[PDB]
Amino acid sequence: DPWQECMDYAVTLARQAGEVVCEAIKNEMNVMLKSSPVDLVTATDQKVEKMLISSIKEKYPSHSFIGEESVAAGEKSILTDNPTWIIDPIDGTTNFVHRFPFVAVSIGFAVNKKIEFGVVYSCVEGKMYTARKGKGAFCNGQKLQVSQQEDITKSLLVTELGSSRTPETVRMVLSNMEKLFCIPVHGIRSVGTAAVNMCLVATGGADAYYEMGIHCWDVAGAGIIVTEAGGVLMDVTGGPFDLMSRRVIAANNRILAERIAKEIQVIPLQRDDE
Amino acid sequence: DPWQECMDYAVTLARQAGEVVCEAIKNEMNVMLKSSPVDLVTATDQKVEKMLISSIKEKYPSHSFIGEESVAAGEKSILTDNPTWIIDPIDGTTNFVHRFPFVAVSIGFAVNKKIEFGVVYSCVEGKMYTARKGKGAFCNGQKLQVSQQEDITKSLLVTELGSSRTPETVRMVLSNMEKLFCIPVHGIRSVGTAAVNMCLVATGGADAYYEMGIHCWDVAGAGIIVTEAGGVLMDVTGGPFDLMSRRVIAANNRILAERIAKEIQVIPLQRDDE
Ligand SMILES: [Mg+2]
Ligand SMILES: [Mg+2]
Ligand SMILES: [Mg+2]
Ligand SMILES: [Mg+2]
Ligand SMILES: [Mg+2]
Ligand SMILES: [Mg+2]
Questions:
Q1: Which compartments is it annotated to reside in (chains A, B)?
Q2: Domains along chain A?
Q3: How far is the CA of B145 from the centre of ligand 4 (A)?
């Protein structure tokens, strides 16, 4: 289809971006600050994003873009019906600065505000995760399938603590963690990137992911990888998944997703579309 | 080197154990319970430990053992001066049951109650971490070096929440995580195994690991990997590291280790030698 040519190009670009990231991770880096001393950015995040947007814009000039570093530079993160490339040039910048081995390039592609395809390249691992609506999810050609776990007490969750250090926000994040932890669940894991956490759910290695504070670019690529692997996306309220809401539950099934939603208390957050 | 032959044999056995683990991870399994509803054990944990102890006895019949599942079977958790093999047949049994991709076979070898060599095989990843006292630390033949970071606010920490679900214990674990998180630190990660968390600090991918509730077998293999990579081991009190204490800080340096010790509160625990 015409979107298959877009998807094939997106895989090529994700690989080229991953090579740049892989090369940069070995060298010294000037770590820069965004919103706080814990919200990081490097020249690599910015360079990768400029290369991806200029590459896609040259090939598809009528297409729209939503990129993390472009939004930090003053661009509007508004989602229209027009074909839109939703990019996180480096998802896991903190991991990248530390050489913690989970660093992803994420590309989500939306038509009529609905994701048609996703590409998440975990470059340190050399794992290319891809999915196209109705075509299934893959990691390096291996077809992915979510786990069958329907018992919350035998489940393994993934989450991240977030970029906020506000004492009130931190208490809510840890209280939500305590509640799920004491259901009990088998455990909670954190690899340091929303996109990779979600791909782990798509593989069946974890049963569900949840987070508040993420943005459309963190989840646009991985969301469709989870659903094409047989999983589900939901808001933390239990309502329909909304890409611009800052909230997500990405699980193997509705039973676990709904059970997680019941424990979570919502953190007030500025939507991506406001 | 009189212990180089024992170490060469330990690498062979850890790899042979890892092949057993890799093969078993693909299939459905009966999951048994230990100290809590989330403290798991399988026929694979038990089989691997038996295979390791019997292979060690064949070559070194005078040697002693401390094994996780052997201790669970009622074997004496005792550390004598005799050459001792300290084994965690599967470190990350929860990950193993879930196919979460961090599962380690860990062997620490002690003489006069001090670690002489350590082997940690992260089987899913295919990463063999090894170290001999005074000979350096390696991952698949590549020399390891801890990071240089001396500023806690620019550090990435690794830890685990533990097998306990006793509300007071859970409260203390999360409270310690909050205090560190708000210093601030760049972040906190959890791959689900003490041995692999420690090996990530030896690589320089994380700056420090801390945990209370672990056992000698969780840390005996990886502790020497951290130190041979240029790091340090300390008790959570700031005092010298003690293998049987259930407490550990494994850091790139004493500056970060001391700052973590100053910030957290001790959880009361039954020592492995009491
Ligand atoms: Mg990013
Ligand atoms: Mg991101
Ligand atoms: Mg960022
Ligand atoms: Mg074990
Ligand atoms: Mg263990
Ligand atoms: Mg165990």
A1: Cytoplasm
A2: 1-144 (3.30.540.10), 145-274 (3.40.190.80)
A3: 26
CA-derived radius of gyration, chain A: 17
C-alpha distances in Å from residue A235, one per residue of A52, A149, A241, B81: 29, 20, 5, 57
Question: Residue B145: what residue type?
Answer: Q
**H or E stretch covering A250:** strand A247-251
Distance from CA of A121 to the nearest CA of B (A): 17
- B205 vs A94: CB contact, 8 Å cut-off? no
Which residues are CB-neighbours of B213 under 8 A, at least 6 positions away?
A: B162, B163, B164, B246, B267, B269
Q: Count CB neighbours of A141 within 10 A.
A: 7
Q: Is-cis flag, bond preceding B2, omega within 30?
A: no
Nearest to B192 by CA among B91, B53, B113: B91
CA of A70 to the centre of ligand 2 (A): 13
Name the resolution in angstroms. 1.7
